[PDB]
Design a protein around this ligand. Sequence first.
Ligand SMILES: [Fe+3]
Ligand SMILES: [Fe+3]
Ligand SMILES: [Zn+2]
Length: 190
Amino acid sequence: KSLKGSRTEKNILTAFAGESQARNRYNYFGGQAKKDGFVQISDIFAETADQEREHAKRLFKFLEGGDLEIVAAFPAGIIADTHANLIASAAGEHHEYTEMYPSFARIAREEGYEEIARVFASIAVAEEFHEKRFLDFARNIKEGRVFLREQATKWRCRNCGYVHEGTGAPELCPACAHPKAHFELLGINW
Ligand SMILES: [Fe+3]
Ligand SMILES: [Fe+3]
Ligand SMILES: [Zn+2]
C-alpha cells in the first residue's frame, strides 16, 4: 500500500538524511586517515561511505515524491584524528543498528509495510559489521598493532601487492618504495 501520511514514510526520509550525512563524514574521515598514514583504514572509510550510498539508494527508492519535513538530530562535526574518527563512526553505527533501524522496522511492521521493515532490519545487519570494523581498527591504533604484531606474519602492500614476512610492515616497500602506511595484514577471503 501507499506510504503517504504514514510514520514509516517519515522514518524512511529520516534514515535517508542520516545515511547521506554518514556518506560524507566517512569520505572526510577517509581523507584524514590517508593524511594520518593509514591507507587500509582510509580505503575502509571510503568503502563504508559507498555502502552508505547504497543503503540510502534503497531507502530513497521507496519514496513516492513530494517534500516532507523531518525533525532529527545529527552530528554537528567534527573531523579529528583517525582514532577519534573511528570511535565516532562506530558510535553512529551503534545507534543505527541498536536503536534507529530496529525501531523503524517495528513501526513499519506495525503499519503493514513488511517489505520495508525487512529492509530496515537487513541494513541494520550491515551497520553492525561496519561498527565492528571501526572498533577493531580503533583498537589496533590504540594498541599500536596497525603495523606491528607479536608474532611474524604476512603483510601486503596495498599499492603494489608486495608481500613482506615479519613481525611488522617495513618502513618502505622494497618493490614500489611507498611508505609503511600502505601495508595491511595479508588477507585471503576466498
Ligand atoms: Fe554503516
Ligand atoms: Fe609496494
Ligand atoms: Zn547505512
